[PDB]
Amino acid sequence: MGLQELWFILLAVLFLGFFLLEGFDFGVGMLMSFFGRAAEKRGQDPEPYRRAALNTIGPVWDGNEVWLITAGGAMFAAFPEMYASMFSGLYLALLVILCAMILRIVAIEWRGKIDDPGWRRWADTGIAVGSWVPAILWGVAFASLVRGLPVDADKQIHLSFFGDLLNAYTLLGGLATCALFAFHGAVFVSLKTSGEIRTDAFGFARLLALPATALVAAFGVWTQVAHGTGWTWIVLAAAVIAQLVAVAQVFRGSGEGWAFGATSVVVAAVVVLLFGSLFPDLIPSTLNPDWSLTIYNGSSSPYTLKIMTWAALVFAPLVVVYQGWTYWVFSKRISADRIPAPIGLSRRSS
Amino acid sequence: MDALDLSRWQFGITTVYHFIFVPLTIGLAPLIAVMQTVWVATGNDTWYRLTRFFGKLFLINFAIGVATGIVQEFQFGMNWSEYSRFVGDIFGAPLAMEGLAAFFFESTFIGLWIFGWTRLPRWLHLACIWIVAIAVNLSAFFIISANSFMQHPVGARFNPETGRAELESIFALFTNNTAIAAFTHAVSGAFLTAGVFVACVCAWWMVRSHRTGGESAADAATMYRPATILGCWVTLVAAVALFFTGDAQGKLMFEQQPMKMASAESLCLDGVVDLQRSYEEKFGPGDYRPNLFVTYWSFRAMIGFLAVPGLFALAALWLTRGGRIPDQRWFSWFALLTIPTPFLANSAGWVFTEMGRQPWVVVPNPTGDQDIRLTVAQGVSDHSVGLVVLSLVAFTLVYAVLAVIWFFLLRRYIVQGPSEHDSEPAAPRPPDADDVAPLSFAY
Ligand code: HDD
Ligand code: HEB
Ligand code: HEB
């Protein structure tokens, strides 16, 4: 019933997987610098602690980021008009996001090839940049998409400075997304480590609890009052309850599994609320509420949608299965005094 | 305004950057798979050192391959919006199928191969690299069929009441004449690249080790000579495959795209003017010619850069006939000069293919419906020059710095050699449920 609506739901699920699996990636990237800096204040050296922080997303980060690529491909396959208009309208944001992603990708994997101390500083800076920038720009982009863009007659969104970074409702979205991803990553590292980086992660999460709570609560209320249907009250209540549960669990210091399920619920509820506050259309128009794209004048065709439905309903469950398995395999636990000695070549950075 | 030339330049620069690294990956995954299989079968630890020594280089290349590929996915909608509305209904299916069926597999399983050297059983660890080697060819098939729709389109309708391509058959799209030949030719090129890489590196290390003497003079005959012979045989069979697939693809190009053919065999009757009059009478006014200089010389360079790897392979298979080891200095210089030529030939071929269909971005099929066609002036987005200069400069600079660092790292790790003295026996891989002091890899 309604291949177009089914593919709306499927695109929502792909973006949900991307956000859910890159939340703790961006959180670890934002937090590894503070992990290293908290070890020097005890006298220890910080390199094993930074490596132990980075190693929690070692074997899984690439498969995590493939979700964004496949979401963009699914947009191009199912809703090509939305693809064209959205990516030609948000030109600078995409340019910045891509320049940051390139640096993160290359730094994560070239960091440990040379044993010079100056070679690792640039790798750490690249990881920090590539983790800090998308964590804000994606929230800004999706908040601006839910709020509406100036679609002129058919295409060609041309926005300057007050339609992309409207202080009201758009930078608040980026702030809320950054805070939520930091909390998610902190409580994720608190679950994959074994005894003295675990307490550091608990301290970071106890410092991050309240700001993330307040920010996502304010963003949810603003969204559901300005752009919201009747059944999204339930999603907002679910997000608030889950955040309260996660905060209460973190301030105890022993659960660490329920506190991760709760933050996963919060992220999923935020994504579901943004998409359900938007369902009938894609890229609403602030110029005229008739020049806006919908799933009814933006989809591809019955045949293409049927072929893509077959492909998805065959390949997505298998991907979920074997990625769950690869998360199970590498899930023992990691200590700081278990990272191998640095084995890299001699010197002369570049 | 002038965003057309800037957009063309940007897309060309970025795709050439990507395909500098693509063929090494596509050709080196199966060679490493074979080198690990022959170790798991025979038990000889000589191939363990080789598979580790080349796995390091493979990873160094894979990182920047992914990084350069990440931008091509969004460039279509960023700079070529009007084109993406025209072919989205069809062009989007191979891209999404690629993302769902090959990128997930390769990304998930290379992470298992990197970190599972002492956590997985040996057969599962071998299956990991075999899966990676198959996925890096599946993705090539998908993306090459996607590009082969742009020239000789087959399964489309052009619904006039919406102004769109509209897909009508997926079987006719995935079994296109052009797609099979292009896939075979590109796979042959990638295997040539990887074979030449392995053969030249091992020949350099064989000439170098023989002169050092002492203890390393015995690594030559046991490790560097068999790898050289394997590389040269791979290079020769890939050269023959390239010849035959290229003849087939040229036979195809004669009938379904005559302007490219008339521009390849130019003088330096005329063809390019009679076809000009014919196209001007078919599709109204306009200029329908490629550059006639880049297209003349890219074909020649692409075909002529094959004489260097062939000569090198034929000389290296004769300098090591019975069991002997070469020591000539000029042989090592020859091996060093032979390395960039496969990359140059691949780039030349892809530049000939792309800049030959140049007035078009969707070439009209002579046995199609003649309404599925689009010049590259109705496909570009409507932007200003100041917005495209930003992206062009940024991407060019970032990729140049990353490529310089990549060359530095590859040269450093090749000069270092296989760390045979630095604890390279077959790992024991003890069972789990033990706080082992290292993890065997930690980034
Ligand atoms: C011959 C086949 C082939 C061709 C013509 C291209 N690629 Fe490529 N691409 C590959 C095959 C490939 C690859 C060689 O298999 C890579 C390089 C390193 C790797 O691991 O995969 C890759 C990496 C790669 C990635 C990284 C995804 C991941 O994390 O696994 C993306 C998103 C793309 N490519 C997309 C493109 C687009 C949009 C192209 C059109 C210009 C393109 N590639 C040229
Ligand atoms: C390296 C090499 C290369 C490669 C790999 C490629 C790969 C490709 N490609 Fe190419 N291209 C090219 C070389 C290329 N290419 C160039 C150089 C350019 C720009 C220039 C011109 O065009 O003029 C292009 C451009 C292009 C474009 C834009 C338009 C124009 O024409 O300008 C498109 C769409 C394309 C498609 C494609 C695809 C889909 C792919 C994937 C398969 N391209
Ligand atoms: C390295 C490797 C290589 C080499 C040696 C070469 C040398 C050559 N080649 Fe080349 N190519 C190539 C790789 C190559 N190549 C590529 C990759 C390309 C592009 C892509 C496709 O296929 O399209 C080319 C392009 C090409 C083409 C296309 C055209 C069209 O467009 O259709 C053809 C036909 C060829 C044939 C050839 C031949 C016959 C030869 C001699 C043997 N090529």
Automatic annotation (TrEMBL), chain A:
The chain crosses the membrane at residues 6-32, 90-110, 122-146, 166-191, 203-225, 231-251, 258-279, 307-330. The keyword rRNA-binding does not apply. It is an enzyme of class 3 (hydrolase). GO terms for cellular component: cytochrome complex; plasma membrane. It is a multi-pass membrane protein. Its EC number is 3.1.3.1. The keyword Membrane applies. One of its GO terms (molecular function) is oxidoreductase activity, acting on diphenols and related substances as donors, oxygen as acceptor. One of its GO terms (biological process) is aerobic electron transport chain. Keywords: Cell membrane, Electron transport, Heme, Hydrolase, Iron, Membrane, Metal-binding, Transmembrane, Transmembrane helix, Transport. This is Integral membrane cytochrome D ubiquinol oxidase (Subunit II) CydB. It comes from Mycolicibacterium smegmatis (strain ATCC 700084 / mc(2)155) (Mycobacterium smegmatis). The gene is cydB.
From TrEMBL, chain B:
Heme 2 binds at residues 249, 260, 302. It is a multi-pass membrane protein. Heme d cis-diol binds at residue 18. Heme 1 binds at residues 8, 350, 354, 357-358. Coiled coil: none annotated. GO terms for cellular component: cytochrome complex; plasma membrane. It is found in: Cell membrane. Signal peptide: none annotated. Its EC number is 1.10.3.-. One of its GO terms (molecular function) is oxidoreductase activity, acting on diphenols and related substances as donors, oxygen as acceptor. The chain crosses the membrane at residues 20-41, 53-71, 91-116, 123-144, 179-207, 227-245, 297-319, 331-352, 385-409. Residues 420-443 are annotated as: Disordered. The keyword Cell membrane applies. It is an enzyme of class 1 (oxidoreductase). Keywords: Cell membrane, Electron transport, Heme, Iron, Membrane, Metal-binding, Oxidoreductase, Transmembrane, Transmembrane helix, Transport. Pfam families: Cyt_bd_oxida_I. GO terms for biological process: aerobic electron transport chain. The keyword Cell membrane applies. Belongs to the cytochrome ubiquinol oxidase subunit 1 family. This is Cytochrome D ubiquinol oxidase subunit 1.
